C-alpha cells in the first residue's frame, strides 16, 4: 500500500499546479503573533469540551471518593466504617 518515489501509489495526478518559495526568501515567523493568539484560541476552543467533560467528571468522582474515605477513618465516621466493612 505504499510504493516509493516515482511510483508511490497515488491515483494519476493532473491539473494541480503547486507553488512555493525558498526558505531563504521567506520570513519563517510571518504571522506568528496572530497564529499564537487567534489560531491557538480557535483550535483550543473547538476541542475544549472533549477534555473538560471527562476530566471534570473523573476528578469529581475521585474527590467524592477520597473525601468519603477520609471521613470514614475519623472518629465521626466510626459507625459508617463499621457497616462499610
Amino acid at each position: 500500500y505504499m510504493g516509493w518515489w516515482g511510483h508511490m501509489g497515488s491515483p494519476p495526478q493532473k491539473g494541480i499546479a503547486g507553488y512555493t518559495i525558498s526558505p531563504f526568501a521567506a520570513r519563517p515567523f510571518a504571522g506568528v503573533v496572530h497564529a499564537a493568539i487567534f489560531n491557538t484560541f480557535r483550535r483550543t476552543k473547538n476541542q475544549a469540551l472533549f477534555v473538560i467533560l471527562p476530566v471534570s467528571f473523573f476528578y469529581y468522582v475521585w474527590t467524592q471518593a477520597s473525601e468519603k474515605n477520609e471521613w470514614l477513618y475519623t472518629k465521626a465516621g466510626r459507625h459508617e466504617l463499621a457497616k462499610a466493612l
Binding site: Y1, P11, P12, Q13, G15, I16, A35, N39, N46
Partner: protein
C-alpha cells in the same frame, strides 16, 4: 464494517417513519460537528482505502472524479499541516457532499459477496 452493511442498515432506518424522524436530525448534526466539510472533504473521501475492494472501486472511478478526489486530499493535507480551516469556496457545502464513490464500492462488494456465497453452494 462493509459499505454494504452500512448502506443496508441506513435504508432500514430511512424506511421507518418514526426512526427517520429521530435519526435523520441527529445524523445531520453529527455531520456538522464532525467538521470534515471544513477541510473541504466530501464524506466519501474519508473511507479507508487500503483494501483490495476499495482499491478496485477507486480504479473504476471516472477520470474526472478521480482527479478531483486527488486534489481534495492534497488540499486537505495542506490545511491539516498548516493548522488552518477551509474558507469560502473550499468549504464543502451540503449540496456538494455527494456519494461519488458509494455506487462503485457497492458493485465491487456485491460481486465479492456473491463469489463467497457461490463458493459454498451445495447441489441439491
Amino acid at each position: 464494517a462493509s459499505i454494504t452493511s452500512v448502506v443496508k442498515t441506513s435504508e432500514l432506518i430511512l424506511k421507518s417513519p418514526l426512526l427517520s424522524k429521530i435519526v435523520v436530525p441527529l445524523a445531520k448534526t453529527y455531520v456538522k460537528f464532525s467538521g470534515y466539510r471544513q477541510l473541504g472533504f466530501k464524506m466519501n473521501d474519508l473511507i479507508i482505502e487500503e483494501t483490495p475492494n476499495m482499491q478496485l472501486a477507486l480504479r473504476r472511478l471516472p477520470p474526472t472524479e478521480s482527479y478531483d478526489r486527488v486534489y481534495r486530499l492534497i488540499r486537505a493535507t495542506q490545511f491539516s499541516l498548516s493548522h488552518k480551516l477551509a474558507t469560502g469556496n473550499d468549504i464543502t457545502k451540503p449540496e456538494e457532499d455527494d456519494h461519488y464513490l458509494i455506487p462503485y464500492i457497492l458493485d465491487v462488494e456485491a460481486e465479492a459477496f456473491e463469489k463467497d456465497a457461490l463458493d459454498n453452494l451445495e447441489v441439491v
